[PDB]
Design a protein around this nucleic acid. Structure first.
Lengths: 129, 129, 129, 129, 129, 129
RNA sequence: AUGAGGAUGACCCAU
RNA sequence: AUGAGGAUGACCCAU
RNA sequence: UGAGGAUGACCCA
RNA sequence: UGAGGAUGACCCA
């Protein structure tokens, strides 16, 4: 089941959706980027490895561009001022079955669901209170 | 207001749903745990820090346990066979507006949506190909 | 949600009630103080820590002041003639479920219920006999 | 007259109530134990001493056991899987009158009354937040 | 009386008012920010501590954005050129009663009232003369 | 003009109003005191300095006294039981226009307005919760 | 320069 | 600060 | 650990 | 004294 296909990263109900597509596969690290310059693109990378004898580990990185007052195709410096970096590390014991793993995916989905604490804090430039 | 509220971490259609509640805010680290013995509980922690002069960093951690009943010293104890750990760090520039942050939240949601590449690989115990 | 709120420490019918309110939550130590002169105020502090691999430990402290006025050089100040110090430590293994914890709390409330041995000895400047 | 009597430590309606009864009063230390196996019993001890010239100090201790059966070599014994330990010290100046003492007792009962911050945190395996 | 609620920081008679709302409570330090990027937001933080045996101390910090020629949602450097920092430290002796403290609040209100020397000097980019 | 004028520091409706007047400008520090013995007077000081190449810093200090009559050496002297100290530093960039500065003054006024969070906490001898 | 550093208060301390 | 560094998990390691 | 003291988030064996 | 540990009337600084 080849899963290295393009998908919708940011969904705005069909209109203004951000699609990210396969762009690199060097070293088993899969990469997806949006149709932009690499300085203003949405980037996603993913890889898996046996971190130790007892665990496997997925490393997922996401890069999101600052859009407000952005100049499409322009040179915007400093780079650090225009990009956000998401860095995810998922450690799963080798005993985890397919079912166990489905549960783990759901926990991640639940964590970021709309209206829940964490995503609400992030979207409002806040912390917890 | 107050975003420090309980929420559903694992959704199984209102039955066997893993719901998590606020349990501690000591040292600026917001904590949530499920109704279980501290040894078998799901745990979620969050904290925001001004990592740099121009950055803010969210550090989020989730612990998914595999519940079991061990028999140490010929006695039964509620324990965890093993634990899966999710570790994410999100660095956001201070110049990001609320709408810029909403864009990051949506990207994270789209990333883990059912059927998309990454959650599919994780749930099937495989890599991206 | 939040339990770091104001509450009635001493209940005297509805009036003369001593209420203690949040004042500080620095370094994992929550603190409650009663209104007016800090010098004549009631104080309550609380904290929890993983005392060891299997134990979590609560450290609770209460201070009951003896309100008085100090005159010196014809200058009077609101002070506490003296203070009574309550100091308790509660150790709970990580295997304790919410039910086990509820039982522990009932034990503490029973220990101090009116008419029982200990609260009666204390209330009468006495010991056991 | 005597306050070294039996009393209800844990109140569960009228049945399932945990009663603790006198067992020993050696060396100024009063001790109460619940019926049946000493190994699975609840324990409460109390003592008072002149800690200094101006202070008298009460030292109270409670033990809540986790009842369980231990099997070894096919030989089972009634034991406590683990124990929760309550430990409190109350210091009271010799100037405190019976009224002052009654106030101190109300403070302790208020601190642990249902719904209040501390008994709620404990009952839920939580801290303050 | 939960006082950690939103309030109007800059009042322009209903039209164009700047409201600041709860955004963080890490370490007992309360934080309020306006609905902006954190680089252009109005920020307010407050905390209290026992500075010494004789005093308590409120530390209040306010950050005000430079608005003239501002680009909403834009990246404006250097940060020091676009922000003003207010740093307040209020030391109150433990003997101060609620009344004493009300007087202290009034002194602060009087200090900054319209038409008075200090606020007039500040609003006109002047000193005293 | 000349903004160095007397003003009402504490307003109690034209009766018992603490009014403060110009008393010294030595060393670039504007001083105001109330009509009292220098030992029992309210004191307000202000000074502006070009703290940096691109900053100006206002340093404001207010002293609220608790008046009393001490009897040193068997003689009566007008003195202060204790003093409360307000210490504020305001750093404003040189690029701030007059309208930018008016915005800072309004923020400080809104901050201390009756009924708002901070002045409420201070007047009640509590923290923010 | 920075400190939710301290003060008796136009001073002191740490970096 | 950086690591498709590790973990028993608000900790540890390398640079 | 302490039926160790305390001017109580400190101190002693 | 200790928001020091405990197999809780013991033990550590």
């Amino acid at each position: 089941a080849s899963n290295f296909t393009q998908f919708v990263l940011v969904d705005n109900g069909g209109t203004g959706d951000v699609t990210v597509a396969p762009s690199n596969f060097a070293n088993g690290v899969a990469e997806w980027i949006s149709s932009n310059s690499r300085s203003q693109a949405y980037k996603v990378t993913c890889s898996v490895r046996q971190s130790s004898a007892q665990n496997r580990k997925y490393t997922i990185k996401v890069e999101v561009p600052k859009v407000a007052t952005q100049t499409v195709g322009g040179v915007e410096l400093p780079v650090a001022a225009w990009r956000s970096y998401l860095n995810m590390e998922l450690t799963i014991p080798i005993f985890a079955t397919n079912s166990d793993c489905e549960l783990i995916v759901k926990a991640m989905q639940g964590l970021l669901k709309d209206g829940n604490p964490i995503p609400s804090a992030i979207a409002a430039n806040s912390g917890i209170y």
